[PDB]
Design a protein around this ligand. Structure first.
Ligand SMILES: *[C@@H]1O[C@H](CO)[C@@H](O[C@@H]2O[C@H](CO)[C@@H](O)[C@H](O)[C@H]2NC(C)=O)[C@H](O)[C@H]1NC(C)=O
Ligand SMILES: *[C@@H]1O[C@H](CO)[C@@H](O)[C@H](O)[C@H]1NC(C)=O
Ligand SMILES: *[C@@H]1O[C@H](CO)[C@@H](O)[C@H](O)[C@H]1NC(C)=O
Ligand SMILES: *[C@@H]1O[C@H](CO)[C@@H](O)[C@H](O)[C@H]1NC(C)=O
Lengths: 128, 103, 106, 114, 116, 105, 105
């Protein structure tokens, strides 16, 4: 009996080079006993069940009592110019708030540049 | 355009981000990340005690931002106690270290 | 950022300027920041002050009820043009809250 | 990276997608030999809600963050009977992304800056 | 700076300014210990030419050069009716009073990290 | 901040005493590698016992005195460094208490 | 991590004992130059015996006790340092076991 850890991943960099579609994966692990299902909402509106494909709970490679599941979803490539953040969610009985909404966006991810601009002054005490 | 990830006032760190459009194409849309720290060189170590030595080292664990403090807050008051021996009567009295912000 | 309200004069003679009034602050200024260095030079402020040039043509009236303060400037000349700011606190720069522009069509 | 900072395990996925007919044999190999398949898990083919005739797959490999950060490519292979040589493989590591430049702009003049 | 060149004794001042009316009680302590009233001199409120109906006052403390050069810290507490806490204080030492060097150790890490 | 400076002998077993906090579920006894500024989790409540310590360590939590005790069975020269214990998903951000270990043989 | 630090005498020969791992084909007995943070392979299963050690060293592998033994014939002052043994293509990222050598004359 442990908290069901969850994660989300963005589409692959080389995937955005054929201009057909894109896939977003929400990984759900743990949740012992295995009681989860994912509903992919966007802007608070649930998507059609035909888009996301959840499969089954599967035991972890080393499974004393733990399990895991994977669920993906298919979108259109040309819609990623705006993101829409395509939120994911999980549900389990071993959760104080029984919801762990997880969402990512084109903006979220690996930074391709780090423009640090530190400054030195003797009047920053107040930090207006 | 820029969203704000960190607005810490204790460390004056403003972590933001923006994605710039490429040369009329949806590819190579390079992402950005702007960080702006403003170090105070006059503040003390214990910001609420005007006796500790000056603050030399500045450690910034960016992960925590997105407890020792470095700068003051324009929206708050800092106070302390000092012994006033007026009339041969040593007396601890509260003192507005940061006045004009305690009104 | 904070608003960039703009005002004009339509020939000299009078002008009126309004800026928001913050709460829990005792100082209010209208520095012109019209210097090459950029360091804003307080023109008319509370806590008792005024500009060597701007005298007798500048006054401040704070109204807590409307959350506004009012400054009235009589007449008009070539010097008192450009841009102006407003703010509070005890640091004319880093304490601004508006960026107003003053112009005259004369 | 939301799992890397936790320093528990680094899970790499190989998203085999689009193979028809439904037959694929994914294997994970490193150091020039296939890693014991037991360390990894994979899923059976499943349909799509788009286009007539397609199948997708999955695979998960668990390796301690430290070992992943130290080195290790951990390439993935796909064995479908329609490939030019019947074998195709992709590879990732830490530095598989666009190089990031630093635009540091230190300023020591108190007059300059905020 | 010129006074310290002589390496004889150092004088620290405390200029109160622009308080109406005239009722400011000033005192000095060294590293949390109050000093004798005879080791410093306090002026009396005097009119302010620039500001009508305003007053100002001075106060000076004298100590040996060795004491100033041992990072000892001195403060100038004041008391007035207008003061919101009725008491306020300012503090200076060797390192803070017009220093010659700016020793800094800027250090940051995990710049990438996970930021949301 | 606090250091138990726990001591022991080669072989046998030694118990590491660390504070058990509240409102923090993941409890770990990270080992301060101090190589490239990275700390590797030795044990956790999420169930992860490092391979080098597999079958030799255990973690028992009981909020009686707000303490969780971790026991290390057997001992090797390798077992003579710093094992900062802490909580929270991030490991190199917790390290609430620092401790040192050695060998007497 | 473990240190056999096997010793010896000038002349004769000395045997270096190192663990023989599985799922790793290249097995080497690198010498820790410790000059610019670089380790030079003395011997390998890929067949590379350094010129200074040519005709004086050998590597025999036999998975009986999961051990491979390397023998160094003759001895010189130069032969008195660290010879970390390991596996894998990257020589500097292996060094499973560390050992020390000296001369008694
Ligand atoms: C920094 O200064 C503060 C204030 O003196 C210290 O905290 C105070 O400690 C005293 C007892 O020593 C208490 O009477 C006060 O109530 C404390 N202040 C508060 C706000 O609770 C603090 O310990 C100092 N920090 C260091 C590192 O010395
Ligand atoms: C880099 O930082 C400076 C200072 O904030 C800013 O003026 C500049 O626009 C930044 N460059 C980019 C590409 O964001
Ligand atoms: C580097 O920084 C300067 C100043 O902020 C900015 O103008 C320039 O665009 C930056 N270059 C890149 C590649 O971000
Ligand atoms: C200046 O900083 C260094 C560390 O960066 C320290 O060794 C030295 O003591 C500092 N100087 C003074 C006068 O404290």
């Amino acid at each position: 009996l442990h908290r069901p850890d969850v994660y989300l991943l963005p589409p692959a960099r080389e995937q955005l080079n054929l201009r057909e579609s894109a896939t977003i994966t929400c990984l759900v692990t743990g949740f012992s006993p295995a009681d989860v299902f994912v509903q992919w909402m966007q802007r608070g509106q649930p998507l059609s069940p035909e888009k996301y494909v959840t499969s089954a709970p599967m035991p972890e490679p080393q499974a004393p009592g733990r399990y895991f599941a994977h669920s993906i979803l298919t979108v259109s490539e040309e819609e990623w110019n705006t993101g829409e953040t395509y939120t994911c969610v999980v549900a389990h009985e071993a959760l104080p708030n029984r919801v762990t909404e997880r969402t990512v966006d084109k903006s979220t991810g690996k930074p391709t540049l780090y423009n640090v601009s530190l400054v030195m002054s003797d009047t920053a005490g107040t930090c207006y | 355009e820029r969203i704000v990830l960190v607005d810490n006032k204790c460390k004056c760190a403003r972590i933001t981000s923006r994605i710039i459009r490429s040369s009329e194409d949806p590819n190579e849309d390079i992402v950005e990340r702007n960080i702006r720290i403003i170090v105070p060189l006059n503040n003390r170590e214990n910001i609420s005690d005007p006796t500790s030595p000056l603050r030399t080292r500045f450690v910034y664990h960016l992960s925590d931002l997105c407890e020792t403090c470095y700068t003051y807050d324009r929206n708050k008051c800092y106070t302390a106690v000092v012994p006033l021996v007026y009339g041969g009567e040593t007396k601890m009295v509260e003192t507005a270290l940061t006045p004009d912000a305690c009104y | 950022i904070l608003p960039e309200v703009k005002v004009e004069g339509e020939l000299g003679g009078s002008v009126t300027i309004k800026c928001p009034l913050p709460e829990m602050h005792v100082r209010i200024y209208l520095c012109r920041e019209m210097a090459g260095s950029g360091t804003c030079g307080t023109v008319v402020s509370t806590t008792n002050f005024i500009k060597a040039e701007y005298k007798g043509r500048v006054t401040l009236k704070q109204y807590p009820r409307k959350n506004l303060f009012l400054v009235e400037v009589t007449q008009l000349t070539e010097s008192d043009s450009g841009v102006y700011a407003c703010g509070a606190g005890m640091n004319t720069d880093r304490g601004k809250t508006q960026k107003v522009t003053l112009n005259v069509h004369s």
